[PDB]
Design a protein around this motif. Structure first.
Motif, mmCIF file in Angstrom:
data_model
loop_
_atom_site.group_PDB
_atom_site.id
_atom_site.type_symbol
_atom_site.label_atom_id
_atom_site.label_comp_id
_atom_site.label_asym_id
_atom_site.label_seq_id
_atom_site.Cartn_x
_atom_site.Cartn_y
_atom_site.Cartn_z
ATOM 1 N N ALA A 18 0.785 -1.084 0.052
ATOM 2 C CA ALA A 18 0.033 0.114 -0.129
ATOM 3 C C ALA A 18 0.924 1.576 -0.091
ATOM 4 C CB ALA A 18 -0.949 0.021 0.937
ATOM 5 N N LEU A 19 0.100 2.299 -0.469
ATOM 6 C CA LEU A 19 0.965 3.737 -0.453
ATOM 7 C C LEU A 19 0.568 4.438 0.691
ATOM 8 C CD1 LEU A 19 2.703 5.303 -2.881
ATOM 9 C CD2 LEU A 19 0.351 6.511 -3.460
ATOM 10 N N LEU A 20 1.656 5.043 1.343
ATOM 11 C CA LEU A 20 1.517 6.049 2.507
ATOM 12 C C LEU A 20 1.113 7.390 1.777
ATOM 13 C CD1 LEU A 20 4.399 5.308 4.814
ATOM 14 C CD2 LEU A 20 2.363 3.966 4.563
ATOM 15 N N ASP A 21 -0.086 7.729 1.925
ATOM 16 C CA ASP A 21 -0.786 8.781 1.288
ATOM 17 C C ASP A 21 -1.353 9.898 2.327
ATOM 18 O OD1 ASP A 21 -1.811 10.816 -0.564
ATOM 19 O OD2 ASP A 21 -2.418 9.077 -1.789
ATOM 20 N N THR A 22 -0.407 11.175 2.272
ATOM 21 C CA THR A 22 -0.768 12.233 3.173
ATOM 22 C C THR A 22 -1.894 13.133 2.782
ATOM 23 O OG1 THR A 22 0.994 13.709 2.465
ATOM 24 C CG2 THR A 22 1.371 12.365 4.412
ATOM 25 N N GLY A 23 -1.966 12.829 1.280
ATOM 26 C CA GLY A 23 -3.188 13.352 0.525
ATOM 27 C C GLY A 23 -4.585 12.921 0.808
ATOM 28 N N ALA A 24 -4.586 11.677 0.967
ATOM 29 C CA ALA A 24 -5.767 10.938 1.317
ATOM 30 C C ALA A 24 -6.325 11.064 2.770
ATOM 31 C CB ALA A 24 -5.608 9.512 0.895
ATOM 32 N N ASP A 25 -7.600 11.615 2.724
ATOM 33 C CA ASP A 25 -8.315 11.790 3.993
ATOM 34 C C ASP A 25 -8.567 10.155 4.580
ATOM 35 O OD1 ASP A 25 -8.428 14.237 3.555
ATOM 36 O OD2 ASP A 25 -10.630 14.115 3.633
ATOM 37 N N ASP A 26 -8.868 9.217 3.768
ATOM 38 C CA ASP A 26 -9.351 7.870 4.038
ATOM 39 C C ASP A 26 -8.435 6.813 3.571
ATOM 40 O OD1 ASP A 26 -11.757 8.984 5.327
ATOM 41 O OD2 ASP A 26 -12.469 9.269 3.325
ATOM 42 N N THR A 27 -8.574 5.566 3.808
ATOM 43 C CA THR A 27 -7.819 4.235 3.497
ATOM 44 C C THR A 27 -8.629 3.468 2.543
ATOM 45 O OG1 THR A 27 -6.170 4.312 5.370
ATOM 46 C CG2 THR A 27 -6.788 2.222 4.109
ATOM 47 N N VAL A 28 -8.193 3.238 1.341
ATOM 48 C CA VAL A 28 -9.109 2.625 0.304
ATOM 49 C C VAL A 28 -8.188 1.343 -0.342
ATOM 50 C CG1 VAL A 28 -8.695 4.127 -1.691
ATOM 51 C CG2 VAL A 28 -10.621 2.695 -1.609
ATOM 52 N N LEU A 29 -8.656 0.200 -0.123
ATOM 53 C CA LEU A 29 -7.910 -1.008 -0.744
ATOM 54 C C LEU A 29 -8.620 -1.562 -1.765
ATOM 55 C CD1 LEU A 29 -6.895 -2.618 2.773
ATOM 56 C CD2 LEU A 29 -5.492 -1.255 0.919
ATOM 57 N N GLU A 30 -8.135 -2.290 -2.618
ATOM 58 C CA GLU A 30 -8.752 -3.118 -3.684
ATOM 59 C C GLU A 30 -9.541 -4.131 -3.313
ATOM 60 O OE1 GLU A 30 -5.125 -4.436 -5.861
ATOM 61 O OE2 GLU A 30 -4.239 -2.290 -5.805
ATOM 62 N N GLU A 31 -10.500 -4.438 -4.342
ATOM 63 C CA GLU A 31 -11.556 -5.497 -3.793
ATOM 64 C C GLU A 31 -10.848 -6.711 -2.851
ATOM 65 O OE1 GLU A 31 -14.650 -5.444 -3.967
ATOM 66 O OE2 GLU A 31 -14.940 -7.381 -2.789
ATOM 67 N N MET A 32 -11.484 -6.935 -1.651
ATOM 68 C CA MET A 32 -11.101 -7.916 -1.200
ATOM 69 C C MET A 32 -12.170 -8.269 -0.106
ATOM 70 S SD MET A 32 -9.016 -5.916 1.875
ATOM 71 C CE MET A 32 -8.661 -7.366 3.078
ATOM 72 N N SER A 33 -12.302 -9.138 0.753
ATOM 73 C CA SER A 33 -13.003 -9.502 1.753
ATOM 74 C C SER A 33 -12.880 -9.129 3.183
ATOM 75 C CB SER A 33 -13.531 -11.161 1.745
ATOM 76 O OG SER A 33 -13.741 -11.578 0.386
ATOM 77 N N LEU A 34 -13.731 -8.736 3.751
ATOM 78 C CA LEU A 34 -13.625 -8.184 5.277
ATOM 79 C C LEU A 34 -14.927 -8.636 5.870
ATOM 80 C CD1 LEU A 34 -12.086 -4.670 4.656
ATOM 81 C CD2 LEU A 34 -11.327 -6.678 6.299
ATOM 82 N N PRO A 35 -14.998 -8.843 7.185
ATOM 83 C CA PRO A 35 -15.939 -9.310 8.226
ATOM 84 C C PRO A 35 -16.747 -8.390 8.616
ATOM 85 C CG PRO A 35 -14.102 -9.087 9.506
ATOM 86 C CD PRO A 35 -13.406 -8.898 8.094
ATOM 87 N N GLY A 36 -18.075 -8.473 8.926
ATOM 88 C CA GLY A 36 -19.037 -7.701 9.285
ATOM 89 C C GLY A 36 -19.863 -6.930 8.306
ATOM 90 N N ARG A 37 -20.708 -6.009 8.554
ATOM 91 C CA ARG A 37 -21.591 -5.056 7.673
ATOM 92 C C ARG A 37 -20.716 -3.982 7.328
ATOM 93 N NH1 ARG A 37 -26.647 -6.043 7.244
ATOM 94 N NH2 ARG A 37 -27.067 -4.080 6.866
ATOM 95 N N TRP A 38 -21.092 -3.385 6.274
ATOM 96 C CA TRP A 38 -20.373 -2.369 5.526
ATOM 97 C C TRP A 38 -21.425 -1.232 5.233
ATOM 98 C CZ3 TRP A 38 -21.748 -0.830 0.558
ATOM 99 C CH2 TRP A 38 -22.383 -1.793 0.033
ATOM 100 N N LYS A 39 -21.041 0.136 5.203
ATOM 101 C CA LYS A 39 -21.672 1.305 4.920
ATOM 102 C C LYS A 39 -21.366 1.804 3.668
ATOM 103 C CE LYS A 39 -24.071 0.993 8.981
ATOM 104 N NZ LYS A 39 -23.857 -0.259 9.251
ATOM 105 N N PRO A 40 -22.194 2.484 2.929
ATOM 106 C CA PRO A 40 -21.873 3.150 1.634
ATOM 107 C C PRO A 40 -20.960 4.624 1.785
ATOM 108 C CG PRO A 40 -24.092 3.657 2.182
ATOM 109 C CD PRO A 40 -23.808 2.720 3.314
#
Ligand SMILES: COC(=O)N[C@H](C(=O)NN(CC[C@@](O)(Cc1ccccc1)C(=O)N[C@H]1c2ccccc2C[C@H]1O)Cc1ccc(-c2ccccn2)cc1)C(C)(C)C
Lengths: 99, 99
Positions: free
Chosen positions: A22-44
Motif C-alpha cells: 500500500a501507498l502512504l498517502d498524506t493527501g488521502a483523508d481515508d484508506t481505500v484498498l482494492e477489492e477484498m473480503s472483510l468481516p461484518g456489515r459495511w456502509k456506503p
C-alpha cells in the motif's frame, strides 16, 4: 523510520492475515484498498479523487498492520487504482511530514 | 517544521508570482494545480487518480516556493479538484515521512 520521497512510499501492510502493498498517502483523508473480503456489515461511501468519484464499501474497526505498526480503523474497499493508506491510519501509527 | 496529519497538510506556495494553498501529497507522483497561467512551453499529459484520468498541461522547470523553501520542477495544470504538491517537489524541499 524515515522515508524519503524519491520513490513512491510503498510499504507492506497486513490485513485479514494477508500481506499487501500500500501507498502512504498524506493527501488521502481515508484508506481505500482494492477489492477484498472483510468481516461484518459495511456502509456506503463516495470518495473523490483526481478523476472524479467512486463508490466504496466502508468497514469500521478493522485491524490493520502498517510497516509493523498496529492500527485498528476504517478501511474502504472498492475500485481504487491502487491501495492507499490515508490520514485516518497514518495518524494512528504516529506518522508526520518533516522538512 | 513538523506537520501533523490530524488535518489535511495544507501549505502556502508561491508560483507564477501568485500565492496559492496546496496539499502536501506523498501519494502524488506529480504536482498538479488548478487552472492558472504559466510561462514557457508545455505538452499535454494524462494523469490518473481515484476516479480516473484528467488531461493537464505539463510545464517544466518552473520555479516554486513551499513554506519558504525554494525549488524548481515540473508543474501540471488542469481540472484537478484541489491543488496538489507531489513527490517531484517534496523531495527538493527535503520533505520526509516519519513515524
Ligand atoms: C478529500 O478526498 C480525499 O482525501 N481523497 C483521497 C484522494 O484522492 N487524495 N488525492 C491523492 C490520491 C492519489 O495519490 C492516489 C493514487 C496513487 C498512485 C497511483 C494512482 C492513484 C493520486 O491520485 N495520485 C496521482 C496524482 C495526484 C496529483 C498529481 C499527480 C498524480 C499522479 C498520481 O500519483 C489528492 C486529492 C484530494 C482531494 C480531492 C478532491 C475531490 C473532490 C472534491 C475536492 N477535493 C482530489 C484529490 C482518496 C484516496 C479518494 C480517499
Amino acid at each position: 523510520p524515515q522515508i524519503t520521497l524519491w520513490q513512491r512510499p510503498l510499504v507492506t501492510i497486513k490485513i485479514g492475515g494477508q500481506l499487501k502493498e500500500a501507498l502512504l498517502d498524506t493527501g488521502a483523508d481515508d484508506t481505500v484498498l482494492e477489492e477484498m473480503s472483510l468481516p461484518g456489515r459495511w456502509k456506503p461511501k463516495m470518495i473523490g479523487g483526481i478523476g472524479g468519484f467512486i463508490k466504496v464499501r466502508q468497514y469500521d474497526q478493522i485491524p490493520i498492520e502498517i510497516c509493523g505498526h498496529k492500527a485498528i480503523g476504517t478501511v474502504l474497499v472498492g475500485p481504487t487504482p491502487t491501495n492507499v493508506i490515508g490520514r485516518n491510519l497514518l495518524t494512528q501509527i504516529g506518522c508526520t511530514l518533516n522538512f
